[PDB]
Amino acid sequence: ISPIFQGGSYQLNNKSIDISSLLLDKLSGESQTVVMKFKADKPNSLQALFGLSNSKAGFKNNYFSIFMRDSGEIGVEIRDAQKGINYLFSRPASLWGKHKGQAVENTLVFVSDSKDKTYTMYVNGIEVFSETVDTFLPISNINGIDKATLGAVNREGKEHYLAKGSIDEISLFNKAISDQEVSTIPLSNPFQLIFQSGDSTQANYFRIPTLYTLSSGRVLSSIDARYGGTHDSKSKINIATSYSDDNGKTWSEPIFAMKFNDYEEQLVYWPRDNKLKNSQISGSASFIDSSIVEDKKSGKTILLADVMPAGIGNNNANKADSGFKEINGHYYLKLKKNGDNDFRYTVRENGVVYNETTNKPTNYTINDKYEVLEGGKSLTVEQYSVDFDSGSLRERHNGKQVPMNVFYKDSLFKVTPTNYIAMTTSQNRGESWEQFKLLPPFLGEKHNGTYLCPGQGLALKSSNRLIFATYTSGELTYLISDDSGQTWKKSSASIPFKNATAEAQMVELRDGVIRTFFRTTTGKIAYMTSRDSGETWSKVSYIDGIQQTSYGTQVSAIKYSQLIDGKEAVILSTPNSRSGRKGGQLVVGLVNKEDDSIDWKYHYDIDLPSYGYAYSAITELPNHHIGVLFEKYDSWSRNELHLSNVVQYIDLEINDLT
Numbered sequence: 001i002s003p004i005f006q007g008g009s010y011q012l013n014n015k016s017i018d019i020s021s022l023l024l025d026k027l028s029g030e031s032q033t034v035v036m037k038f039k040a041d042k043p044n045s046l047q048a049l050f051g052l053s054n055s056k057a058g059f060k061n062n063y064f065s066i067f068m069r070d071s072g073e074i075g076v077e078i079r080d081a082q083k084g085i086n087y088l089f090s091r092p093a094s095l096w097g098k099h100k101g102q103a104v105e106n107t108l109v110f111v112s113d114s115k116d117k118t119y120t121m122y123v124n125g126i127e128v129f130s131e132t133v134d135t136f137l138p139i140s141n142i143n144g145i146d147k148a149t150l151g152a153v154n155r156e157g158k159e160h161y162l163a164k165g166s167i168d169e170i171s172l173f174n175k176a177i178s179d180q181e182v183s184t185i186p187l188s189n190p191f192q193l194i195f196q197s198g199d200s201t202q203a204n205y206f207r208i209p210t211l212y213t214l215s216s217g218r219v220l221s222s223i224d225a226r227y228g229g230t231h232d233s234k235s236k237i238n239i240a241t242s243y244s245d246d247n248g249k250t251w252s253e254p255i256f257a258m259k260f261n262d263y264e265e266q267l268v269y270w271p272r273d274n275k276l277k278n279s280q281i282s283g284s285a286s287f288i289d290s291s292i293v294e295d296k297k298s299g300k301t302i303l304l305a306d307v308m309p310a311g312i313g314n315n316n317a318n319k320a321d322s323g324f325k326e327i328n329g330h331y332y333l334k335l336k337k338n339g340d341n342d343f344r345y346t347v348r349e350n351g352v353v354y355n356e357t358t359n360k361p362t363n364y365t366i367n368d369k370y371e372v373l374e375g376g377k378s379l380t381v382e383q384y385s386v387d388f389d390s391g392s393l394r395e396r397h398n399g400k401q402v403p404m405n406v407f408y409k410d411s412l413f414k415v416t417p418t419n420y421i422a423m424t425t426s427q428n429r430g431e432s433w434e435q436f437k438l439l440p441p442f443l444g445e446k447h448n449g450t451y452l453c454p455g456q457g458l459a460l461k462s463s464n465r466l467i468f469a470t471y472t473s474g475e476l477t478y479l480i481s482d483d484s485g486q487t488w489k490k491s492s493a494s495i496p497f498k499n500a501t502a503e504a505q506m507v508e509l510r511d512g513v514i515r516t517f518f519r520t521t522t523g524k525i526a527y528m529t530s531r532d533s534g535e536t537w538s539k540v541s542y543i544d545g546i547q548q549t550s551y552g553t554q555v556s557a558i559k560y561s562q563l564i565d566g567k568e569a570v571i572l573s574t575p576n577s578r579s580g581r582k583g584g585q586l587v588v589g590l591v592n593k594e595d596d597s598i599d600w601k602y603h604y605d606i607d608l609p610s611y612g613y614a615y616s617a618i619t620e621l622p623n624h625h626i627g628v629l630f631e632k633y634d635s636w637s638r639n640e641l642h643l644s645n646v647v648q649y650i651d652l653e654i655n656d657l658t
């Protein structure tokens with residue numbers, strides 16, 4: 001239905017625009033919708049886009065405002081001192097600033113619903129908050145409202161929260177429009193979603209994107225589908241995949257590459273308040289940090305990820321235990337049975353559960369899905385679900401039976417509580433995935449598994465060699481296969497770091513010459529070089545010209561297929577910031593053929609230096625465009641946890657970058 005007010009092309013240049021006479025006497029009833037299309041590519045630190053206020057002496061705290069911050073945060077205030085109400089609702093990382101050098105038109109829809117007593121904010125087609133209150137306050141029923149303002153809030157006659165930006169369209173309605181109606185408002189988004197809340201994964205959150213271009217032209221993506229908010233393991237996390245057959249324009253409904261079922265796939269709104277935001281699913285098994293590669297010989301797609309048994313993450317993983325027993329140079333998965341104090345069992349060939357104390361097989365076998373069988377019969381456990389109904393996190397049996405898995409909390413036989421690496425493969429380029437297999441230990445019986453570097457593995461162009469980077473304390477540990485991922489060996493490369501999250505990604509500069517770029521603890525991205533297809537590695541150097549935080553962020557990297565300025569080119573994707581995970585860039589490097597040094601010549605700013613940018617994935621699309629799927633928020637910040645739909649995809653051309 002019709003707007004009660006519609007206006008457009010307002011410039012906000014640190015000077016508010018009064019629209020009181022046009023708008024105020026049109027406001028009626030207690031439910032309102034505001035639709036606003038606006039740009040702000042050089043915002044002030046904190047600025048209001050729209051205000052309704054009592055501008056009179058003594059009523060400073062009687063106003064409604066829609067505001068934003070230069071962090072990309074959006075929100076509203078709804079205040080009335082006489083009613084003793086001061087509502088503030090917001091969500092960080094909700095905005096775009098610029099795309100390809102041009103200011104992005106954001107589409108904001110705020111719904112104020114008196115019947116449901118609920119305030120709801122959408123930006124660019126994404127619901128960023130929905131808040132129900134006991135005492136509802138209609139936005140134009142604030143005591144003494146006498147001003148409607150764009151680009152500030154009028155308090156006691158003065159301009160507060162002055163904005164820099166533009167409002168190209170603003171409309172208001174004397175109605176709380178439905179979610180359906182909202183879905184019909186046209187958008188001008190510079191991005192698309194591949195994985196999103198409410199899709200087939202039923203995870204409300206995602207982290208750790210990957211992208212890889214397959215030989216058929218299909219582009220494949222993997223990701224952590226994270227259920228218990230955005231926390232790393234321990235949690236419930238599955239690995240999901242989606243592909244595009246039209247150069248990234250459209251993407252398939254996701255399927256799982258790796259999943260556990262000890263806990264239900266629940267789409268949950270994780271609390272963001274300071275008291276509860278660190279609530280963590282503590283009894284679920286999970287997968288985390290995936291990586292993809294394609295094998296020329298078999299044609300298979302290979303996907304690796306870390307695996308965590310129930311309640312396990314990096315923080316509490318048994319270090320100094322691989323979880324395997326070594327026997328005659330062969331490694332067998334250890335198991336502990338209900339009631340025992342030690343691990344007295346192993347998993348041998350054909351999944352036979354073997355008793356180590358009495359050196360004989362049992363009537364138990366482990367199938368191909370790491371599920372427990374007794375006499376060929378499937379054992380089961382009861383599934384858990386989570387809720388916050390009690391006012392805090394509970395994990396409780398839900399009445400459903402699922403196959404009993406050795407990675408589960410309720411299992412008869414349980415693996416060592418430490419981290420593993422698993423592998424799965426697809427024979428149809430991402431349409432389905434095999435049951436996962438555990439990789440063996442590479443650094444000994446009594447060393448925990450290395451940590452997979454999320455992103456792409458490396459398929460050497462002139463041989464059948466496949467390489468996956470991993471890391472542990474003191475080194476990068478490259479996993480190398482020459483037989484389609486059937487057998488792996490390691491190649492250790494010392495780095496001058498203890499306890500670094502040394503997430504590494506590789507590019508082949510030329511045949512047999514690999515440069516690996518990796519995260520460090522120094523505030524600088526490091527690199528090392530191999531010239532024998534990964535057998536040996538150079539000492540470590542650093543890139544100047546890009547800054548990271550002390551704790552660092554994953555960097556993604558590819559070798560571009562086409563020459564640029566007549567030179568071989570590498571493209572890096574990373575935040576460029578010493579302060580947080582923000583200031584996303586693609587950095588184009590040109591290779592110097594005389595020494596393989598790289599001149600970082602072009603820096604492309606993905607969005608504003610202050611807008612969030614964290615883990616990232618890049619790939620050269622079949623049409624030579626660049627696809628970027630990235631965390632568009634600060635995934636380190638304790639203030640930006642548990643945000644929906646912030647992993648986003650964009651398409652760029654090389655000319656945009658240069």
Ligand SMILES: NCCCS(=O)(=O)O
Nearest residue numbers: 232289501552635636
């Ligand atoms: N991938 C393991 C480290 C994730 S994070 O650096 O804490 O965001």
